[PDB]
Amino acid sequence: LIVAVASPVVVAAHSPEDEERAEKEAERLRRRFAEELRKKGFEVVELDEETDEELRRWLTKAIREATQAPTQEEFNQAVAEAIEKALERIEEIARRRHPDREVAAVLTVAVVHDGEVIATIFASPRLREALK
């Protein structure tokens, strides 16, 4: 199984220094997750910078739109749907790049809130299936 891991999407950083701090924390999380995948025998690949930046632009816009929701619950559902569609698109892109293999995807999302970085890893459906 080839797992394509996207560059982290850092959202709402107040300064370039905070964004770099969030990028490093999210990259460390992605690195630890990728090493865990390789222990399971999975090949881990990366996207090109243009695809990563298109993913960043789209998911940041989707998250910005979701802040208009009236409740946390509706916000959660909007962002979860956006993440699911972004994961599906990364799988499709990676499948076209590696058509001889089964492909899965991993998305990392980070935020800076009250001076701290919170980062989270999201696995595509095929990856979750493979990890069973």
Binding site: V11, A12, R21, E25, A26, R28, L29, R32, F33, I63, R64, A66, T67, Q68, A69, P70, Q72, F75, N76, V79, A80, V109, V111, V112, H113, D114, E116, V117, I118, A119, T120, I121, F122, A123
Partner: peptide, 30 residues
Amino acid sequence: KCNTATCATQRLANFLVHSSNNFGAILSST
């Protein structure tokens, strides 16, 4: 909607912690 200032970051932070807890995603924080 998010009318305040830290509303957007607080909403997203809550989601990330919610995803880790209620859906088994993997989270890290400083």
